[PDB]
Amino acid sequence: GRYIGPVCRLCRREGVKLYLKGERCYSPKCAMERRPYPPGQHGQKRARRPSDYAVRLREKQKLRRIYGISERQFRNLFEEASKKKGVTGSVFLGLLESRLDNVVYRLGFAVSRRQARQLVRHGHITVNGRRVDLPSYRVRPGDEIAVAEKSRNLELIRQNLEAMKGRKVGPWLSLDVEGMKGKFLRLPDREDLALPVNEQLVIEFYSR
Amino acid sequence: PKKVLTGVVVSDKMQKTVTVLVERQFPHPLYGKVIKRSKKYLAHDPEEKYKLGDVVEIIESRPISKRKRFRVLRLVESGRMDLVEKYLIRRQNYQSLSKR
Amino acid sequence: RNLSALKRHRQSLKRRLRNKAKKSAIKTLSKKAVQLAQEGKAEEALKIMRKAESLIDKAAKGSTLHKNAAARRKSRLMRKVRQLLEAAGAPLIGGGLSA
Amino acid sequence: MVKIRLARFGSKHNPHYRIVVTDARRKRDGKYIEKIGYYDPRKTTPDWLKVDVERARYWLSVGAQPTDTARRLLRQAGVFRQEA
Amino acid sequence: AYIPGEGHNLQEHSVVLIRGGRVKDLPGVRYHIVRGVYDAAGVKDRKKSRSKYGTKKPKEAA
RNA sequence: UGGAGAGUUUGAUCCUGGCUCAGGGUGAACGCUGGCGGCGUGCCUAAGACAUGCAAGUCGUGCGGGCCGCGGGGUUUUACUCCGUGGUCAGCGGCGGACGGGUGAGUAACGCGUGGGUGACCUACCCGGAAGAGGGGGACAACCCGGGGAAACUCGGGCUAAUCCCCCAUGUGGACCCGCCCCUUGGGGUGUGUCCAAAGGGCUUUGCCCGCUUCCGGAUGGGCCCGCGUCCCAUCAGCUAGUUGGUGGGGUAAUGGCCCACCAAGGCGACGACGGGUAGCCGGUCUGAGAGGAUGGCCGGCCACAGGGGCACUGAGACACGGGCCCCACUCCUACGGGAGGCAGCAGUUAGGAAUCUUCCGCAAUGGGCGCAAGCCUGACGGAGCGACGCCGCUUGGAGGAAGAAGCCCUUCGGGGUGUAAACUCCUGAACCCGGGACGAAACCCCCGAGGAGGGGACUGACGGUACCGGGGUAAUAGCGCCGGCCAACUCCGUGCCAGCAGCCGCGGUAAUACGGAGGGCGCGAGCGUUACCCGGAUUCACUGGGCGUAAAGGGCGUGUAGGCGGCCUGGGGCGUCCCAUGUGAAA
């Protein structure tokens, strides 16, 4: 269970537009702008003071919304991040963002999350000679994100590669659309992924 | 290796063997404070050379008899009346108690 | 049900026989020895020393008696005998004993 | 007596035979008197081979009988050498 | 031994697999009941207590 | 690189302080749902009981026949035997059974973890050095004659071989006696006297292969002992006579009351004896910031047991799971005279319980054993299956798409809300179809170098057409608790202290956001809920880290034992402190 179905229903849940559902959830509303109130029945019925612990866990939720993952593996990821010596927070953020599918997303081959996964976990992607599926494969500072050879002469392939020619994606990602490659360069950061996330409160829900 | 230790001679009494009250000491495994711990051992003597008190340095040896582990070696001191007096007070107080 | 572990204990019975035989033979050999030495004899007593010592070699040879134990019994034997000869006498012909 | 033997490890379908000196008593996984190498029968990674001829020679000289895949180990790693 | 709650049956056997818990009465209450054990399969119709109150996952015809 | 509290005593405050949960966790369990794979884990209780198949053998390079074999010699030929001689049951013999397997029953214990003495030992198949391999005589199988018994198999008897067995030897030598020299716990030499050694088999035979003899150092594990640590009760205080000691014997591989003889009165204790209850121990494992507290299953070493026992035997070693002897206990075969047995081994059966599997497969890897090897077993191991029982990766779609459909809940009838969710178009293609396809495997073995270095031949895969590769390829499982405050998320009928929910205040007595139903929404999601059991929170048995005037708590107050901690100065000693070097602490 990785959720799925009505996704940008959770876009307006927090009211902070979460692209996530492709071109529609990008241009005129992320199932958001139209009715950007937290759904259900109430919504337009006045909320509370979200107890500090609760909304700290809510920026935690928000965090995992920005990925489209289950809380389990994601949890384990947090352990692995907070432990091995580093600046735990930034480490955590960029780390989670080093997940294979999202690489292939922010890179440009995907428009968001579910699609990213679908075609990454498809085996339609190849890294350094070997073609691989698993989205939760967090790559390393020095890899090559290429895409398959029967995945060249194909459709929505040409779509995502169409809209991308003439765009700018992250620095630590090298874009070579003449030869279907993507260099997984330097480690990103908090200022490489500056977005509606406060890693602090997240961490401390996790760091109970 | 063949460890050795001290000891105040306790009691000839037995033939061709004497008992000895040894010393050991050690801290506490959570509470600090070093504490005292006496220990009686079989001090061996083929020729009754150590009398009431005689402190000596005693030794690991081949099991020569029954609980008669250890032996001795060389002498340290004599006139050990007061210390072993308080020992005889240990036995004294042992008889200073009963539950009948 | 069936297995050549009966083999094992068949042979083992045989070894029991071996042991008990040679063993008790040695016992009484040693005993006529201690008698003769006890009274005070020499010659034939130290002859018993001879044959018995040979025997205790066959003992330190096969799986009846053995090395340390064989030399244990032998030592106790030839030592013992020396004690009681001298007890009111002096041996003339040795054997297992020197001088 | 003392011998010179191999001992599988790893997990399921990824064995790797550890070169240990052990008397014929100590069972496979059981224990080792000393490890002095590794032979990987499947070949995977340049970790798949190493022996130490020094201790091998030690045990050999003072008395220790190797096995047969160990005979392979000497056949290749030339622990059976003598030079000249 | 109490019960899990509504739906009264259990003639004399049922096997109240004891589970365990007091309430502010019947001096003790400890060691409850399960239903569906060897008998007593919950209460007729349910929606949430179906983790002890039997009635599996009751699906209609649509 | 490491720490959060919350409700709970009142009319309100603040402390004292037990309760409770938010939390991590398992070899689990149950209820609800149930797709794939890898890797694990799977009687925690009856140490009750067991049907049938398999669990330890090999060796004809140790030795003689029966009998299945063949050339067929003898027999003029016959009967047939027997000279040569594969196979197969045995015998004598050689070696393993003391390794691999397991459970907590025992075990307050040098048994275990640990640091060492061994001048108190032992050690074979293995390495190194040595002196050697003359000769004799016998014995019982196999076999043949005959009795018993349903079976068990027992019984008198006459033969055959040997590496079986003993006898004089030969002495590199070891043993003892005493003599003497070094040592200083039975450690080392020498002399005098006696002691004993041997096995041959194979062949290409005059050399080699597998092996006999007696001793010295080592490679390996175990023995005994020592230092220290190893729970709950004081409502278990005195204890004990082999008991503390000694001389002389027996014992054993070794000292030792382990035992005997004899004699002297000691040995343990409030530093917890003696007594009883509970538990086999650890490397490590969960948890707290740590201190610690608890825990000991697969795995690694150490122990104990073979339904309880007692016991020797045998051996290098055992008091020996598939060796034995007697009582016991229980089950079974029986012709009721006789007799047989040990799944705490691998599968399962029954009981018991809340719950703990498949009587599948290969010796192909690797390991034990025996053989010179080829080899034969191996329920070790190496692999398949079942269970979300634990962990990790995972698909059930993407994308577009209404100021927003039917259906459904509220409603102030304005609308709201469900839900871009589906429908409606495109793409991508779980499983499913085909064809292909292993890693695990190169040594042993055959051959030249000498059999050394090495060099070439070549065998061997249970798992399994499985892993996977390439082609074809369908939108393809979704449930679980909660929704008062803790603790994040509420409107609507129901019901009227009735049914009910409950870890804590407790909630409902006609108008319940707490119970049931629903719309929706919170957390999670191949899982979720529920109880069971362990640390923290608990600074709520506190060393860090409290206390004690009224909250629980100064012994009524004096006394001295022992005990605990002790003024100022100088110097001598180095146990605690301390530091360096170091040994170990394995691996996991």
UniProtKB/Swiss-Prot annotation, chain A:
Keyword NAD: no
Residues given in the record as Zn(2+) binding sites: C8, C11, C25, C30
GO terms, biological process: ribosomal small subunit biogenesis; translation
GO cellular component: small ribosomal subunit
Cited InterPro entries: Ribosomal_uS4, Ribosomal_uS4_bac-type, Ribosomal_uS4_CS, Ribosomal_uS4_N, S4_RNA-bd, S4_RNA-bd_sf
Positions of the S4 RNA-binding domain: 99-161
Stored SMART domains: Ribosomal_S4, S4
Keywords: Metal-binding, Ribonucleoprotein, Ribosomal protein, RNA-binding, rRNA-binding, Zinc, Zinc-finger
Entry's Gene Ontology molecular function annotations: rRNA binding; structural constituent of ribosome; zinc ion binding
Signal peptide: none
Top-rank taxon, per record: Bacteria
C4-type zinc finger span: 8-30
Essential cofactor(s): Zn(2+)
Family per record: Belongs to the universal ribosomal protein uS4 family.
Described purpose of this protein according to its UniProt entry: One of the primary rRNA binding proteins, it binds directly to 16S rRNA where it helps nucleate assembly of the body and platform of the 30S subunit.
Classification via HAMAP family: Ribosomal_uS4_B (MF_01306_B)
Subunit comment: Part of the 30S ribosomal subunit. Contacts protein S5. The interaction surface between S4 and S5 is involved in control of translational fidelity.
Protein name as annotated: Small ribosomal subunit protein uS4
Organism phylogeny: Bacteria, Thermotogati, Deinococcota, Deinococci, Thermales
Gene: rpsD
Curated annotation (Swiss-Prot), chain B:
GO CC terms, sorted: cytosolic small ribosomal subunit
InterPro entries on file: NA-bd_OB-fold, Ribosomal_uS17, Ribosomal_uS17_bact/chlr, Ribosomal_uS17_CS
Annotated SUPFAM superfamilies: Nucleic acid-binding proteins (SSF50249)
Recorded GO MF terms: rRNA binding; structural constituent of ribosome
Subunit note: Part of the 30S ribosomal subunit.
Function of the molecule: One of the primary rRNA binding proteins, it binds specifically to the 5'-end of 16S ribosomal RNA.
Protein name, as recorded: Small ribosomal subunit protein uS17
Organism for this UniProt entry: Thermus thermophilus (strain ATCC BAA-163 / DSM 7039 / HB27)
The encoding gene: rpsQ
Swiss-Prot record, chain C:
Region span, Disordered: 1-26
Domain of life: Bacteria
Keyword Ribonucleoprotein: yes
Biased composition (Basic residues): 1-25
Keywords, comma-separated and alphabetical: Ribonucleoprotein, Ribosomal protein, RNA-binding, rRNA-binding
NAD recorded as keyword: no
Family: Belongs to the bacterial ribosomal protein bS20 family.
NCBIfam families linked: S20
Protein name: Small ribosomal subunit protein bS20
The species this protein was found in: Thermus thermophilus (strain ATCC BAA-163 / DSM 7039 / HB27)
Classification lineage: Bacteria, Thermotogati, Deinococcota, Deinococci, Thermales
From Swiss-Prot, chain D:
Family: Belongs to the bacterial ribosomal protein bS16 family.
Record-level GO BP terms: translation
Alphabetical keyword list: Ribonucleoprotein, Ribosomal protein, RNA-binding, rRNA-binding
GO-annotated molecular function: rRNA binding; structural constituent of ribosome
Record note on quaternary structure: Part of the 30S ribosomal subunit.
Known function: Binds to the lower part of the body of the 30S subunit, where it stabilizes two of its domains.
GO cellular component, one term: cytoplasm
Transmembrane domains' residue ranges: none
Name recorded for this polypeptide: Small ribosomal subunit protein bS16
Disulfide bonds: none
